[PDB]
């Protein structure tokens, strides 16, 4: 009928364990893990083993995984027990549950039975960390990193505490001193904490927001034509200049090629010292400023 309703149906099909049961599973899971590593090291070093001993060693490797999976399936209810408390903070319940299961996995990987502590005592840390670590990683569409997500929560914490001490929302200078940071830092943090909004959202009636965004780089027909008319006007001026003079002005700004060129690079094509190119440039520019040549382009200024 419902997705989550289906998952709880199946996790409940495994009976919860007791302390002695946990310790045993934690032993077999550990022996199988060492039995596996032992055999791998042997091939590198040689060290063949008794044909029979190797047989029941490989079975211990195989047997440890049943202990691993049996231990996980028994404490799945614990994950859901912890995940419920974090719904509605930007993550679906199932995603919280799965990330919690990841923490449960490591808890099993890192569990120590010799300490004699109940499993739920230690596994709760890993499930809680795996869920919150996941929320910082995913809950936001723009994905602030963890340390920055940590300072945001700490800042809001401070504002909350202070608000009760002061009776009013604090000013940036007060939060800056209370957190031991600069007032321009806390302001920069409050800009990061902004969360996005949906274009597909609608605003009054039947009009989605998305239809109001301008395309900035869209070609504006009134300017692109004048640009074409402008580059034709410049083509006229070049015919008035000396053939060497017109060639220099282009290459310096790369009108034909589309890329500028430095003087030394303009010296190779014309086989002259780069200073001479600078001199020719200066004389030709001043002549371009001459009253006759530039009169038309004044109006084309903007």
């Amino acid at each position: 009928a419902d997705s989550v309703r289906a998952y709880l149906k199946q996790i409940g099909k495994v009976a919860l364990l007791n302390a002695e049961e946990e310790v045993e599973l934690a032993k077999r899971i550990e022996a199988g893990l060492y039995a596996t590593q032992k055999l791998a090291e042997l091939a590198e070093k040689g060290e063949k083993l008794p044909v029979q001993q190797r047989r029941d060693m490989q079975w211990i490797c195989r047997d440890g995984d049943r202990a691993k999976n049996h231990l996980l399936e028994a404490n799945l209810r614990l994950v859901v027990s912890l995940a419920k408390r974090y719904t509605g903070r930007g993550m679906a319940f199932l995603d919280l549950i799965q990330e919690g299961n990841l923490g449960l996995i490591r808890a099993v990987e890192k569990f120590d039975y010799t300490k004699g502590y109940k499993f739920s005592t230690y596994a709760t840390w890993w499930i809680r960390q795996a869920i919150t670590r996941a929320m910082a990683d995913q809950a936001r569409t723009i994905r602030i990193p963890v340390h920055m997500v940590e300072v945001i929560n700490k800042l809001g914490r401070i504002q909350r505490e202070l608000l009760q001490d002061l009776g009013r929302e604090p000013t940036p200078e007060e939060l800056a001193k209370e957190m031991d940071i600069t007032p321009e830092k806390v302001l920069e943090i409050q800009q990061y904490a902004r969360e996005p909004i949906s274009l597909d959202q609608t605003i009054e009636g039947d009009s989605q927001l998305g239809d109001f965004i301008e395309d900035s780089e869209a070609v504006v027909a009134v300017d692109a034509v004048s640009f074409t008319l402008l580059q034709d006007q410049l083509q006229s001026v070049l015919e008035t200049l000396s053939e060497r003079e017109a060639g220099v002005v282009r290459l310096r700004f790369g009108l034909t090629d589309g890329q500028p060129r430095t003087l030394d690079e303009i010296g190779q094509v014309y086989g002259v010292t780069r200073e001479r190119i600078r001199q020719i440039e200066s004389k030709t520019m001043s002549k371009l400023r001459h009253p006759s040549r530039s009169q038309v382009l004044r109006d084309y200024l903007d």
Binding site: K27, E30, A31, Y34, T36, K38, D56, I60, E109, K110
Partner: protein, 36 residues
């Protein structure tokens, strides 16, 4: 170079502790087949 289940196990128990554990586990299967 990840951090694997072996690394996490070796960090908390020496090879002599693991070896003695393996010996116990080996004797269990040893008793099963040998002793009725």
């Amino acid at each position: 170079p990840p951090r694997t289940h072996w690394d996490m196990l070796l960090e908390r128990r020496s090879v002599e502790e693991l070896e003695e554990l393996l010996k116990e586990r080996l004797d269990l299967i040893k008793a099963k087949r040998r002793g009725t």
